[PDB]
Design a protein around this ligand. Structure first.
Ligand SMILES: NCCC[C@H](N)C(=O)O
Ligand SMILES: [K+]
Ligand SMILES: [K+]
Ligand SMILES: [K+]
Ligand SMILES: [K+]
Ligand SMILES: [K+]
Ligand SMILES: [K+]
Ligand SMILES: [K+]
Ligand SMILES: [K+]
Ligand SMILES: [Mg+2]
Ligand SMILES: [Mg+2]
Ligand SMILES: [Mg+2]
Ligand SMILES: [Mg+2]
Ligand SMILES: [Mg+2]
Ligand SMILES: [Mg+2]
Ligand SMILES: [Mg+2]
Ligand SMILES: [Mg+2]
Ligand SMILES: [Mg+2]
Ligand SMILES: [Mg+2]
Ligand SMILES: [Mg+2]
Ligand SMILES: [Mg+2]
Ligand SMILES: [Mg+2]
Ligand SMILES: [Mg+2]
Ligand SMILES: [Mg+2]
Ligand SMILES: [Mg+2]
Ligand SMILES: [Mg+2]
Ligand SMILES: [Mg+2]
Ligand SMILES: [Mg+2]
Ligand SMILES: [Mg+2]
Ligand SMILES: [Mg+2]
Ligand SMILES: [Mg+2]
Ligand SMILES: [Mg+2]
Ligand SMILES: [Mg+2]
Ligand SMILES: [Mg+2]
Ligand SMILES: [Mg+2]
Ligand SMILES: [Mg+2]
Ligand SMILES: [Mg+2]
Ligand SMILES: [Mg+2]
Ligand SMILES: [Mg+2]
Ligand SMILES: [Mg+2]
Ligand SMILES: [Mg+2]
Ligand SMILES: [Mg+2]
Ligand SMILES: [Mg+2]
Ligand SMILES: [Mg+2]
Lengths: 34, 56, 117, 142, 150, 110
RNA sequence: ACGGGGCUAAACCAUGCACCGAAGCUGCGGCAGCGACGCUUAUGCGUUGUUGGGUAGGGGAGCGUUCUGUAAGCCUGCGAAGGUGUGCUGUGAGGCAUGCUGGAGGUAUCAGAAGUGCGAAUGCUGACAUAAGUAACGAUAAAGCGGGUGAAAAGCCCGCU
RNA sequence: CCCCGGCGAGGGGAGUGAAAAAGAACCUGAAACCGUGUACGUACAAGCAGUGGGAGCACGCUUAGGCGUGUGACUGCGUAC
């Protein structure tokens, strides 16, 4: 958790924004190098 | 899609070379009031082409 | 004994940006780009102190070759004839006489033609 | 002392006329490239155009050796895909004969804004006639 | 530094340089990397090196004419005006006074003169023998330094 | 004699006012007032009140005459920006800049 | 599938003499390192030989910053520090002088002590850019006109639809 | 106190003060960044944007000339850290 953010004090868990595997439109067919 | 390099202040001023405003050249003089107005528009005191058109 | 860096670091940055005048864009304003450009301008200047001596001898030889062919001889026979006639004038002075005193250049060609014949 | 530099406002250029009848193409083109550059003058400066004006007459009667009249091929591309185009020496003579000498000299000139200004002093004509009698061109038997 | 040991954000994923502490010395309001403690700066001098240095300082004061030897150096009352008058009559202004054992009138009368130190022969030190212009010793104090310096 | 009027902390960006100030640069002030009247911009309302106040400054504090005046200098500078917070989707917060300007109009008969 | 133009030699083989060509060598001027011999040194100068690309790394010698002593000294309202130009100077880090700004501090020399030098660490904090006057202005239930107020009315008030 | 403005915001005078470019968004007031004015360059021209050479123009000097400053047509070499 990010507990003392000064630019965004309203949010503590922000990895649903910029991490591609944690976005709502991530599909597991993007991970096809298996 | 986003830039890979920051565009310069030179490139920004080149894009704005068509953003300049055109001044109105055409101010008519009403032939009984002497007031200036746009062409084919009424005057501020409500005249148009010599006569009182709006009684305002 | 706490040392603040404000005055010393400002004088060091201002010294680089004074040497970067006339450069384009961030190369004259921004220290990270200007410092990088002042070093490259010093490498070029060191290299071109050697290249300046190559380019002027290239220019003197091309001018000697043109004025010698006006008198009926090539460069390579005019140089060989002056070495055989014990003339020790260098290519800087020969290309200077070839422009400014054209009949003195004719005298050198006739000296070189006599030493070959 | 600094070495002399020719100044482009006080350079003297002169006018010459050359007859290309029976000349070898490349051996004529090398001499035209010297005089348009100004390599024959002692005032030669590598950044100044000190050359001469040359009129070339009878460009359709220039000569090549070997089998080059049917085998030398000129290529260009149009910028559209699949757009490579070719022409033999005999077709360039029949269609537009002045280009043969103009292409040969252009390859021997320097590349850049000064070499394009050296090319502008070359006047090539397919026949025996030019209309530059007011400039009084000197006959250059080269 | 005041503050908790909470990791400021998670290790991977947020697209930003990794953190472990708000008190890190890289950060504003963080700790000092090699923060200092109270320390003892005193050095050791050998006894023979200390006494050998005092003899060199005393020999230069004789050689450079900066040493003055007297029978008596006393004032009659504990008055600053008396000592300032007395030193004016010897052309001394910046001077260290070393005497046999210390007079109460002379100690009080010199307390307000900033150029004048008044000492007994026991409390001498190598820096004051160099810092003052002239050194005035009484004849009783001159003999006490020799027993001190063997 | 040169005469200044200024509007500091004018609520608009400098790029928008500079479009209107380039219309009247160098003009006689009677011609410049007519250009601003028939320009359909919010910045043309702002620049006209500074030009009108510079004309009144020059005849009251300097004793000049209105028929002689010209706009010799005009320039817009950037002022302080106000920082606002704009909510975006999924918990994102953006910063809004509310840009201000310093308008300077200069009149003189010479 | 000559770097290009072009070439029947401007190709290939053999012989020969010229010339071009490098930071190589030579010439002229300057600096430094290590040896050797000396106008004699007191550890510096003179003559001579030779050397001087450099990462990791080892050795040597310095510049500058804050603080303490020297300093109850020295500089300074006839203008300190700081800021911004210009000129001169050293092999370099640098130094010195001065115009303008500034309005009260600064500090030689020789020593002493270090929170002693920043472009990088998806460094930390603040300020300001770029994209860009671009996207968007949050339910497609919908507005039109007359009058009022006001510096200003598509949005407020009143009325009728 | 006077003037423009909406009995605004903001400004121009006047006055105080050694100083108001010390005016309350207040000592000093660097840099990034953004403008106005002036000199020169730039609309046939291809690339780490410099460096070596170099014409012309403008402003200073000072001379029986060719130096200083700014700009840099054209040209050799040159793929940031
Ligand atoms: N327990 C709910 C806390 C919500 C908080 N603002 C967060 O972003 O986690
Ligand atoms: K805590
Ligand atoms: K100063
Ligand atoms: K950084
Ligand atoms: K923008
Ligand atoms: K809507
Ligand atoms: K002030
Ligand atoms: K500034
Ligand atoms: K160049
Ligand atoms: Mg909340
Ligand atoms: Mg990233
Ligand atoms: Mg702290
Ligand atoms: Mg003991
Ligand atoms: Mg005292
Ligand atoms: Mg949204
Ligand atoms: Mg929410
Ligand atoms: Mg080749
Ligand atoms: Mg040779
Ligand atoms: Mg060489
Ligand atoms: Mg060499
Ligand atoms: Mg060598
Ligand atoms: Mg080495
Ligand atoms: Mg001190
Ligand atoms: Mg200081
Ligand atoms: Mg100064
Ligand atoms: Mg440090
Ligand atoms: Mg930094
Ligand atoms: Mg580094
Ligand atoms: Mg701040
Ligand atoms: Mg802040
Ligand atoms: Mg941004
Ligand atoms: Mg776009
Ligand atoms: Mg669009
Ligand atoms: Mg839209
Ligand atoms: Mg809505
Ligand atoms: Mg309606
Ligand atoms: Mg209505
Ligand atoms: Mg005063
Ligand atoms: Mg006043
Ligand atoms: Mg004060
Ligand atoms: Mg201030
Ligand atoms: Mg400022
Ligand atoms: Mg052009
Ligand atoms: Mg063309």
């Amino acid at each position: 958790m990010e507990n003392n953010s000064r630019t965004m004090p309203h949010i503590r868990r922000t990895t649903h924004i910029m991490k591609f595997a944690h976005r709502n439109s991530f599909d597991f067919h993007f991970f096809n190098a298996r | 899609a986003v830039q890979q390099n920051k565009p310069t202040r030179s490139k920004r001023g080149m894009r704005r070379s068509h953003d300049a405003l055109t001044a109105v050249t055409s101010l008519s003089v009403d032939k009984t009031s002497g007031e200036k107005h746009l062409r084919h528009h009424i005057t501020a005191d409500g005249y148009y082409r010599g006569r009182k058109v709006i009684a305002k | 004994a706490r040392v603040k860096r404000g005055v010393i670091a400002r004088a060091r940055h201002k010294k680089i940006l004074k040497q970067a005048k006339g450069y384009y864009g961030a190369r004259s304003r921004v220290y990270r780009v200007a410092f990088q450009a002042v070093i490259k301008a010093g490498q070029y200047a060191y290299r071109d102190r050697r290249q300046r001596k190559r380019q002027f001898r290239q220019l003197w030889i091309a001018r000697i070759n043109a004025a010698a062919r006006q008198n009926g001889i090539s460069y390579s026979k005019f140089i060989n004839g002056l070495k055989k006639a014990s003339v020790e004038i260098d290519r800087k002075i020969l290309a200077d006489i070839a422009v400014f005193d054209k009949v003195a250049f004719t005298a050198l060609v006739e000296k070189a033609k006599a030493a070959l014949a | 002392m600094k070495t002399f530099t020719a100044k482009p406002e006080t350079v003297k250029r002169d006018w010459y006329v050359v007859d290309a009848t029976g000349k070898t193409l490349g051996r004529l083109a090398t001499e035209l490239a010297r005089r348009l550059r100004g390599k024959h003058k002692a005032e030669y400066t590598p950044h100044v155009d000190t050359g001469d004006y040359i009129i070339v007459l009878n460009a359709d009667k220039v000569a090549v050796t070997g089998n080059k009249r049917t085998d030398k091929v000129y290529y260009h591309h149009t910028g559209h895909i699949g757009g490579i185009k070719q022409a033999t020496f005999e077709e360039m003579i029949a269609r537009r004969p002045e280009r043969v000498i103009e292409i040969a000299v252009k390859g021997m000139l320097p590349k850049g804004p000064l070499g394009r200004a050296m090319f502008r002093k070359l006047k090539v004509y397919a026949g025996n006639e030019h209309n530059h009698a007011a400039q009084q061109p000197q006959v250059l038997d080269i | 530094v005041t503050g908790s040991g909470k990791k400021p954000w998670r290790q991977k994923g947020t697209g930003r340089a990794r953190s472990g502490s708000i008190k890190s010395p890289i950060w504003r309001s963080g700790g000092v990397t090699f923060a200092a403690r109270p320390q003892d700066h005193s050095q050791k001098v050998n006894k023979k090196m200390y006494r050998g240095a005092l003899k060199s300082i005393l020999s230069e004061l004789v050689r450079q004419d900066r040493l003055i030897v007297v029978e008596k150096f006393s004032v009659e009352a504990p008055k600053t005006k008396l000592l300032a008058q007395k030193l004016k009559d010897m052309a001394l202004e910046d001077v260290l006074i070393i005497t046999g054992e210390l007079d109460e009138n002379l100690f009080l009368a010199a307390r307000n003169l900033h150029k004048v130190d008044v000492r007994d022969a026991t409390g001498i030190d190598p820096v004051s023998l160099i810092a003052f212009d002239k050194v005035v010793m009484t004849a009783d104090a001159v003999k006490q330094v020799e027993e001190m310096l063997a | 004699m040169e005469t200044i009027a200024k509007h500091r902390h004018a609520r608009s960006s400098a790029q928008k006012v500079r479009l209107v100030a380039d219309l009247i640069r160098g003009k006689k002030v009677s011609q410049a007032l007519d250009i601003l009247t028939y320009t359909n911009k919010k910045a043309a309302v702002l620049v006209k009140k500074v030009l009108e106040s510079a004309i009144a400054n020059a005849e009251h504090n300097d004793g000049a005459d209105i028929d002689d005046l010209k706009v010799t200098k005009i320039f817009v500078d950037e002022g302080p920006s106000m920082k606002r917070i704009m909510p975006r989707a999924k918990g994102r917060a953006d910063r809004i800049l509310k840009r201000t300007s310093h308008i300077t109009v200069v009149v003189s008969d010479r």
